[PDB]
DNA sequence: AACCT
DNA sequence: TTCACATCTATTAGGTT
RNA sequence: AGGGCGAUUUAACGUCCUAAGGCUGAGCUCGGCAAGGGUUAAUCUCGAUUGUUGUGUUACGAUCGAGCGUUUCACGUGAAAUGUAAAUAAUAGAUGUGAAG
């Protein structure tokens, strides 16, 4: 459903019309830093305040009911009938009552209505209150509070109150935030494609010096033009480099239909020598990565990470912030889209695949186990971000993705499904102690995968399991 | 400079006797978690209504500053009379009546700070159902010490949000609550408690341990406050502080 | 461009 | 004391002066 | 040797700047200084038809040809598209582990 696409911006003015509409940017993006962090205090407040208060009076009513009952119907017994166990229960609730007591009374005190004080003075009125903060454009606010509505909200729904988890602390990196319908698409006299953005200089889209290869930008920004890809809710960040980048969040409607063949899935595994090897169900097969780039490029990647590593240790403080926070970021975001880019890869080479030949389901061995982690070339991955991948592109196509325990995939012929001890005697090549069937070892473990049907949701519902 | 020593603790006695001691403990905690809980979020409103705006005033000060920019924009462009006269003499008694309003709302919130501030703030009397009457000392020195730090840390501007309290804080001890002496070490505490210390040999460490603690019953080093929690496998682990001065 | 919800 | 990564949640405003 | 810069992310190629893996400021504290070139191009040789800004500025490309190297399909050969190659869902917090004084 939802997408995102990034796209680079510029001003349209003198030099120095650059600076006003830069700082404009700023100030906005630390005004909605400051509203965010007071507005998860007031309602976090109000929160807390409403169980701490009359709610422990009422919760405490139903506790001396309930115990009431409880020694009640303990009395009962006692009547129909061991008696000691009946005594100490009864002396257990006595005290119960005794202490409760003591709360009800403490409760009944009755010196201040804090709760309606707070209710009407802030919390019912947190729009007109954040205006202490000075909002340049004045409309954000209505962005600020339904965020922080709907995450304190969510956030209390996942345990807030009970102790597990701590209260939100946004950082000053968020960035800022645009309303839907504020961002108007409207051709130019150059051919260029220029956005109106209120309260000062609209914007003009980068887009490609000549138009060979950026023909997929120009038909979204079209699309998006004569409205068919519906515009929603978008952000404003800075990069390190101070260039503009405007994350065009699009709500595209999927009608697209792909007719599949009724029960043939797919099937991966991780080997030592495929990234990810595949194969069908139902002389079938795609190989996807190569070990002679992967393996290559990420040696030299963590080796001059060391590099620097020893470096800033060795130097005295490395000359401190401004080469460490240098450093820090640079290698920090070069791995993390090296990583990102990588797992787009595999993820986009198994969708396709699986739509060429116009797959239904697909099957693949379940990740983030003990095993599954060793035994494979992406010895130390971001396993998440594929398992994220594969069911968005998936679910785009109409493809379901579930998963199945990896016990005896890699020593199970798929032909005749013995288990038997070294029967992968060879590296390189697969042979059956029982029918004597020579395919290839990752050949055999797709196929292994593809046949299976015990799916499996959690850690703990495996065959080995510790 | 002051240091945290981690060590492992066991406690001997009956099987009825063990799980009353660990039920009391984990009682103990939950109520302490509970107590910092209410402390905060009450000193919290007590920061938050004083110093910071309320929700009317500024619906009201908004129109106050919109009449006098108003005001000022019609003086300038003025230098058929009679309308922007009355227009003008209407927008300065309603100036009068906003400043007036302004004034008796902020006078409410003052006095309603001042009444909650010793009516349910100078001590807290509330009860959770504590068994032990210290642990109300420690609590309060608690909370007062951190909205102190983290208000001068932007808490106040809006810089960061309050600091919640989670349920694995570890349980606050008195630094006279517990004593400790060989019989190995047994940890002599409060409501009748004598925990012992499994000095047992472990890869990593616990043999300089057997040094510090030999140290420390000498009586060369004084204890500070200390703290007492779970663990993700139950050993009730003992965070000792022990300072150096 | 703001307010209300 | 202060920085990194892996797993896992929910989200992406409408209407009206 | 690192980094900008080529619509964004990676790796290589192209061109520029440097011990910014620096220096300089003010009152133990806080800031500033870099990067296509110029009409044959900023990422295949060349051919034809064409432009655009006007000068060291926010205002250098389009269309047919060939050659040249890629991917896929049938039986090394033939067909298509390609123009460095592979991609294009992105934020925010919470909880879990490591490294460095």
Request: with cysteine; aromatic share 8%.
């Amino acid at each position: 459903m939802i997408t995102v696409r990034k796209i680079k911006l510029t001003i349209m003015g003198d030099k120095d019309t650059r600076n006003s509409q830069y700082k404009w940017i700023r100030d906005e993006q630390y005004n909605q830093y400051r509203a965010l962090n007071m507005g998860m205090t007031y309602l976090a407040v109000n929160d807390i305040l409403y169980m701490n208060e009359s709610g422990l009076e009422i919760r405490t009513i139903k506790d001396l009911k309930d115990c009431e009952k409880d020694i009640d119907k303990n009395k009962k017994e006692i009547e129909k009938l061991k008696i000691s166990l009946v005594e100490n229960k009864i002396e257990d609730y006595k005290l119960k009552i005794v202490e409760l007591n003591k709360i009800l009374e403490e409760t009944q005190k009755e010196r201040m209505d804090i709760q309606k004080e707070f209710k009407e003075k802030y919390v019912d009125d947190l729009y007109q209150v954040l205006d202490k903060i000075p909002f340049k454009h004045l409309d954000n606010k209505s962005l600020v509070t339904q965020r922080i509505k709907a995450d304190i909200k969510s956030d209390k729904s996942n345990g807030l109150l009970k102790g597990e988890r701590s209260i939100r602390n946004y950082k000053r990196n968020f960035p800022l935030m645009t309303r839907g319908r504020d961002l108007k698409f409207k051709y130019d006299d150059n051919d260029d494609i220029e956005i109106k953005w209120m309260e000062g200089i609209k914007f003009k889209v980068i887009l490609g010096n000549r138009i060979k290869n950026s023909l997929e930008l120009r038909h979204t920004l079209h699309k998006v033009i004569e409205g068919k890809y519906k515009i929603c809710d978008s952000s404003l960040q800075f990069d390190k480099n101070n260039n503009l980048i405007l994350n065009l969040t699009l709500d595209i409607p999927i009608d697209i239909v792909n007719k599949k063949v009724s029960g043939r899935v797919v099937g991966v595994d991780l080997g030592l020598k495929i990234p990810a090897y595949c194969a069908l169900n139902d002389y079938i097969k795609k190989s996807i990565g190569r070990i002679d780039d992967f393996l290559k490029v990420r040696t030299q990647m963590q080796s001059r990470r060391r590099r620097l590593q020893i470096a800033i240790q060795s130097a005295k403080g490395g000359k401190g912030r401004v080469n460490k926070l240098q450093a820090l970021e640079r290698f920090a975001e070069k791995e993390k889209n090296f990583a990102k880019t990588y797992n787009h890869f595999l993820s986009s080479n198994i969708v396709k695949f699986a739509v060429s030949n116009q797959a239904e389901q697909i099957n693949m061995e379940l990740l983030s186990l003990k095993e599954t982690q060793n035994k494979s070339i992406l010895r130390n991955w971001s396993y998440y971000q594929l398992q994220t991948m594969i069911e968005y592109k998936a679910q785009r196509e109409g493809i379901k993705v579930k998963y199945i325990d990896p016990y005896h995939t890699s020593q199970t012929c798929s032909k005749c499904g013995n288990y038997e001890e070294g029967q992968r005697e060879s590296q390189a090549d697969f042979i059956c102690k029982k029918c004597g069937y020579k395919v290839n070892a990752d050949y055999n473990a797709a196929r292994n995968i593809a046949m299976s049907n015990k799916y499996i949701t959690k850690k703990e519902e495996s065959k080995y399991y510790k | 400079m002051i240091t945290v020593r981690k060590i492992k603790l066991t406690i001997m006695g009956d099987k009825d006797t063990r799980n009353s001691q660990y039920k009391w403990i984990r009682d103990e905690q939950y109520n302490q978690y509970r107590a910092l809980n209410m402390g905060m979020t009450y000193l919290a409103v007590n920061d938050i209504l004083y110093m910071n705006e309320s929700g009317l005033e500024i619906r009201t000060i908004k129109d106050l500053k919109d009449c006098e920019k108003d005001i000022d924009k019609n003086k300038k462009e003025i230098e058929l009379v009679e309308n922007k006269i009355e227009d003008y003499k209407l927008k300065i008694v309603e100036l009068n009546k906003i400043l007036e309003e302004t004034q008796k709302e902020r006078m409410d919130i003052q006095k309603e700070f001042k009444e909650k501030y010793v009516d349910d703030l100078y001590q807290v009397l509330d009860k959770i159902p504590f068994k032990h009457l210290d642990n109300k000392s420690l609590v309060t020195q608690r909370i007062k010490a951190d909205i102190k730090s983290d208000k001068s840390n932007g808490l106040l501007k809006g810089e960061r949000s309050i600091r919640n309290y989670k349920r694995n804080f570890p349980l606050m001890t008195r630094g006279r609550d517990l004593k400790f002496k060989y019989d190995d070490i047994e940890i002599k505490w409060m409501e009748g408690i004598k925990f012992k210390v499994i000095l047992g040999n472990r890869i990593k460490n616990s043999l300089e341990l057997r040094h510090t603690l030999h140290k420390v019953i000498e009586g060369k080093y004084k204890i500070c406050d200390s703290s007492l929690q779970f663990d993700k496998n139950n050993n009730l682990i003992l965070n000792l502080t022990l300072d150096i001065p």
